[PDB]
Design a protein around this ligand. Structure first.
Ligand SMILES: [Zn+2]
Lengths: 416, 393
C-alpha cells in the first residue's frame, strides 16, 4: 500500500514538525511520536513515562474522559497509545473525513494536558493492575529479568516501573516528565495517508493554535549521551512453582546501536535463528521438537540486546540451551555462512513486506525512524544496504559481538 | 472479490487489493463433524499439512505462513508468501489436495501436539466457547466433536476425508495468483461433488465439560484456569440471511469486557467474575447467538439472572445505545471465512452499508425471535447445568 519511497516534513512556526508519507487507501494513521520512555528515567522517577501516558489519555480540559468515550462510541475516533523503553506515541486510525477532530484531540491531549492530583492518584490502581496482568505473562517477566541483570543502567528498569515505584509516583513527577519530554523539539506529528501533505499540515496548524513557541532549546533530556547504557553479562535463576513441570529460559548478548554498520548483520543473524511457530523452524535448529523459540534484537542508545527465549519441560531445559548455542555456532562455519546470510536477508525482507500493508505499522516505523535516527533511512536505501551486506559483514558482527563473549542468562523454573 | 468457475467445475475466488503479500488456499465443506470423534479431523488435516510442506525447515526457508482452520461443518487452509516463493507454496497446496494418507509417524507427532493444546496456548477461551456452544445447542450429537482431545481419549486418522478434499475444494487467493491457481485447479478432477449441508436444529440441552485446565497456558499463568465458564446458546440465523447484520448489532448492545450491558450489569454485578461476552456464531444454514461468562463455579446462577435481567433491558433501549452498537461494528482469512459462508466480508464497503441500514424494528424482531427460546446451557466446570436453566422461566 506504500509506494516504497520517502516522507515529506514541514515545520509550523510554533515548532511542531509534521511528517507525512503517501499511501493509497481509505485509511489514515496519525498522531504524535515522542522520544519518551524508560531509557531516559533514573532510579528516582522510574515508571513515570508510562504513568504519564495514562494520565494524558485520561482526558484534559477541552476533552474530559467522558467526551473521549463519546468520540469512540459515536464519532469513530479510536485512541491508541504506548510506551517502549525508547519512545512513546498517541495515535488514531481514521477515515479521512474525521481528520480535523482527530488532529484537534490528539494535539490537545499530548500538547495540552491538565495534570491534577485527583487524575494521577485515581490512575494508580489501573497501573498496578496492568503491572499484575503483565507479570502473569512469563515471556514479559523473563524479558524484563534478562534486561535487569544485563543493564545496571536505565534499560534494566521495567517500562511500567517496579511495584514500589508505581506506588510512589507523585503528580510533580508526572508534570516534570511532561514539561521535559513533551516539547515541540522532542516530538513529531506523523501521518500515513492519501490526503496531500498540505491538508494535514493545515489541519495540525488549526489544531495547535494555542501552542506558544519555545524561547530556547536546553539540550533534550532524551539525549542518548545523557543515558549511556552498559551491558554486563549475568546469570540468574528464579522460582515460580506454579509453573509446574516447566521452565522459561532467556539468553542475551549485547547488540549494536541503530546506526552501527553492524546493526543490519545483527538483524540478519537473529532472523536466521528466528522463531519456532506451528509449522516453521530455522534450518539452523537441530532438534526441531523444541517446544518454543523467540528471537529479538533491539538497539538502546549506544548499546542494545539480542535475546533468545522460550519454555520447555524441566527435563528439556538444558537441551534447549544447547540447541540455541549450537545454532548460533553453526552460522559462523564456512560451510554455512553463506546460506545463513541469504536466509536471514530473506527473513528481513519478508518482515518488511508485511509491515508495508498496515498504516499503523508504517506510522510506528516512520515515527521511530525520525526520532531515533541520526538521518532518516528510506525503505529504499534500507533495501540496498541489506543487499550489499556480505559474508564478511556477518563474520565481523560475530567477532565484535558473539565469539568469546559471555551471554546473560535467566532461568525461571517450576521445581529447581 | 472475483468469482470464476474452471473448465473442470472448480470454483475460484480472488481477493482484490494491493500486491506485496501473495495468498493462496483451499476451503471445503469437511469439518470436525465429518469424523467419528473430537480431534479426528483436526489431526488428520494437520498431519497432511505438515507432510505437504515437506518440513518446518522448508516452510522457514521460503518464509511461508500457513494457516489451518478447522470448523464444525467446514475447514480452510491458507498460505501467505512473497512472490519468490510461489512455486513452493503452489506445490505444497497441490500435495495437500492429492488424497494421500500421511505416514503414521506424523500422525503420532500431531496427536502429541493436540493432547498438549491447552498447555501450548492453542486452546483459549474463544475455543472453549465454541466447544460449549456446539456440544449444547445442537439436536445432532456430531457437533460435539471439537478439535482438541480430552486427556483420556483416542484420536484416529480419517483417511476418507483426505480423498474427499479435492472433490469439494473451492480455491481462494489474492488477485495476482490468478494464473497460478487456474493451472492448479486445472489439475484437480472434474467435477466437484455436491452434498446437501443443512446445519442441525437448535436444542436446549444442558451439559458439562467438567475438566481440569492447565495452570500454564502458552506463556501465561492463566488468570482463569480455576474459574468456570457458562455458555448460554439461542438460535439466530445463517450467514446469508438478511437478518445477519441485525444480529451483529444485537451482539454489540450486549457487548462485554474483562477487568455495554454485559460489562456494567454482569462483570460489575458479580464480584469474582473475570469476563462476560456475547458473540454471534454463523454456520452453513443457521446461527447461534451465545453469551459467555467466566466466574467462580458457585456464582453461575447469579450470573445467569443478571443475563436474564440483561435480555429484559434490551426492549427499552435508547438510540444513543442503538447508535453506539452500529458504531462498534490476515485480512485474507476473513476473505476466505466469508467466501464459504457466501456473505459479504467484515471489512467490505457493502457490509458496513448493511450495519448503517439496520432499523430498530430489525433489532427488536431479532431479539424477540431469539430469546423466545429456552437457552442451551453448557458448563466448563462442575456446576449443575439445570440449575442455571431454571433461571429462564
Ligand atoms: Zn499502560
Amino acid at each position: 500500500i506504500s509506494r516504497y519511497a520517502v516522507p515529506q516534513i514541514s515545520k509550523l512556526s510554533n515548532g511542531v514538525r509534521v511528517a507525512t508519507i503517501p499511501v493509497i487507501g481509505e485509511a489514515t494513521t496519525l498522531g504524535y511520536w515522542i522520544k519518551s520512555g524508560s531509557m531516559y528515567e533514573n532510579a528516582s522517577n522510574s515508571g513515570v513515562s508510562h504513568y504519564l501516558q495514562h494520565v494524558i489519555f485520561r482526558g484534559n480540559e477541552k476533552y474530559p474522559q467522558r467526551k473521549l468515550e463519546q468520540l469512540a462510541e459515536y464519532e469513530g475516533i479510536n485512541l491508541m497509545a504506548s510506551t517502549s523503553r525508547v519512545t512513546t506515541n498517541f495515535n488514531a486510525t481514521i477515515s479521512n473525513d474525521k481528520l480535523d477532530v482527530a488532529t484537534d484531540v490528539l494535539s490537545q491531549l499530548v500538547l495540552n494536558p491538565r495534570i491534577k492530583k485527583s487524575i494521577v492518584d485515581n490512575e494508580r490502581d489501573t497501573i498496578l493492575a496492568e503491572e499484575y496482568e503483565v507479570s502473569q505473562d512469563i515471556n514479559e517477566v523473563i524479558w524484563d529479568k534478562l534486561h535487569e541483570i544485563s543493564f545496571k543502567t536505565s534499560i534494566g528498569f521495567p517500562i511500567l516501573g517496579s511495584h514500589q515505584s508505581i506506588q510512589k509516583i507523585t503528580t510533580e513527577m508526572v508534570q516534570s516528565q511532561h514539561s521535559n519530554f513533551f516539547n515541540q523539539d522532542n516530538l513529531y506529528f506523523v501521518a500515513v495517508t492519501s490526503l496531500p501533505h498540505d491538508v494535514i499540515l493545515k489541519s495540525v496548524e488549526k489544531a495547535t493554535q494555542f501552542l506558544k513557541p519555545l524561547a530556547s532549546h536546553p539540550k533534550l533530556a532524551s539525549d542518548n549521551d545523557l543515558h549511556v547504557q552498559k551491558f554486563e553479562p549475568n546469570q540468574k535463576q528464579y522460582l515460580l512453582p506454579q509453573l509446574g513441570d516447566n521452565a522459561f529460559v532467556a539468553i542475551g548478548f549485547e547488540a549494536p546501536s541503530l546506526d552501527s554498520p553492524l546493526y543490519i548483520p545483527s538483524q540478519i543473524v537473529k532472523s536466521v535463528i528466528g522463531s519456532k511457530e506451528k509449522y516453521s523452524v530455522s534450518p539452523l535448529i537441530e532438534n526441531t521438537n523444541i517446544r518454543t523459540l523467540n528471537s529479538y534484537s533491539f538497539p538502546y542508545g549506544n548499546s542494545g540486546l539480542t535475546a533468545f527465549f522460550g519454555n520447555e519441560s524441566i527435563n528439556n531445559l538444558n537441551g534447549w540451551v544447547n540447541t540455541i548455542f549450537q545454532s548460533i555456532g553453526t552460522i559462523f562455519s564456512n560451510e554455512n555462512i553463506e546460506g545463513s546470510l541469504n536466509v536471514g536477508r530473506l527473513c528481513v525482507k519478508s518482515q518488511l513486506a508485511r509491515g508495508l500493508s498496515s498504516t499503523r505499522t508504517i506510522a510506528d516505523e516512520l515515527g521511530n525512524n525520525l526520532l531515533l535516527r541520526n538521518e532518516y533511512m528510506s525503505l529504499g536505501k534500507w533495501d540496498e544496504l541489506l543487499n550489499a551486506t556480505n559474508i564478511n559483514n556477518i563474520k565481523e558482527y560475530f567477532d565484535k559481538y558473539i565469539l568469546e563473549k559471555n551471554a546473560s542468562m535467566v532461568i525461571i523454573s517450576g521445581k529447581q | 472479490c472475483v468469482s470464476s468457475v474452471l473448465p473442470n467445475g472448480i470454483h475460484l475466488k480472488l481477493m482484490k487489493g494491493p500486491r506485496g503479500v501473495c495468498s493462496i488456499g483451499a476451503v471445503f465443506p469437511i469439518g470436525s463433524i465429518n469424523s467419528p470423534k473430537t480431534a479426528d479431523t483436526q489431526v488428520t488435516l494437520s498431519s497432511k499439512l505438515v507432510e505437504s510442506l515437506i518440513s518446518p525447515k522448508h516452510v522457514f526457508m521460503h518464509q511461508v505462513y500457513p494457516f489451518l482452520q478447522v470448523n464444525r461443518e467446514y475447514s480452510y487452509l491458507t498460505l501467505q508468501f512473497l512472490p519468490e516463493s510461489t512455486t513452493y507454496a503452489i506445490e505444497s497446496l497441490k500435495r495437500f489436495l492429492d488424497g494421500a494418507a500421511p505416514a503414521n509417524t506424523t500422525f503420532d507427532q500431531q496427536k502429541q501436539l493436540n493432547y498438549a493444546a491447552e498447555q501450548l496456548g492453542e486452546y483459549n477461551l474463544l475455543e472453549k466457547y465454541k466447544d460449549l456452544v456446539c456440544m449444547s445447542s445442537f439436536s445432532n450429537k456430531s457437533y460435539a466433536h471439537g478439535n482438541y482431545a480430552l486427556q483420556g481419549e483416542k484420536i484416529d486418522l480419517n483417511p476418507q476425508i483426505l480423498k474427499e478434499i479435492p472433490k469439494c475444494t473451492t480455491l481462494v487467493g489474492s488477485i495476482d495468483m490468478y494464473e497460478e491457481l487456474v493451472k492448479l485447479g486445472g489439475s484437480l478432477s472434474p467435477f466437484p461433488k455436491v452434498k446437501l449441508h443443512i446445519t442441525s436444529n437448535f436444542e436446549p440441552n444442558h451439559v458439562n465439560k467438567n475438566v481440569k485446565q492447565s495452570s500454564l497456558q502458552g506463556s501465561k499463568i492463566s488468570m482463569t484456569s480455576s474459574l468456570s465458564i457458562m455458555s448460554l446458546s439461542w438460535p439466530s440465523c445463517g450467514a446469508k440471511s438478511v437478518e445477519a447484520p441485525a444480529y451483529a448489532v444485537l451482539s454489540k448492545i450486549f457487548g462485554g469486557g474483562s477487568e455495554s450491558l454485559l460489562y456494567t450489569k454482569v462483570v460489575g454485578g458479580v464480584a469474582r467474575c473475570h469476563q462476560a461476552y456475547a458473540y454471534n456464531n454463523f454456520f452453513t444454514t443457521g446461527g447461534r447467538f451465545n453469551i459467555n461468562v467466566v466466574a467462580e463455579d458457585r456464582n453461575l446462577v447469579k450470573a445467569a439472572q443478571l443475563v436474564r435481567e440483561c435480555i429484559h433491558s434490551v426492549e427499552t433501549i435508547e438510540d444513543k445505545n442503538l447508535d453506539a452498537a452500529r458504531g462498534l461494528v490476515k485480512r485474507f482469512n476473513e476473505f476466505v471465512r466469508s467466501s464459504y459462508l457466501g456473505c459479504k466480508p467484515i471489512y467490505s464497503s457493502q457490509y458496513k452499508k448493511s450495519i448503517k441500514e439496520v432499523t430498530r424494528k430489525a433489532v427488536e424482531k431479532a431479539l424477540k425471535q431469539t430469546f423466545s427460546y429456552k437457552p442451551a446451557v453448557a458448563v466448563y466446570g462442575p456446576a449443575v447445568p439445570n440449575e442455571i436453566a431454571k433461571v429462564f422461566e
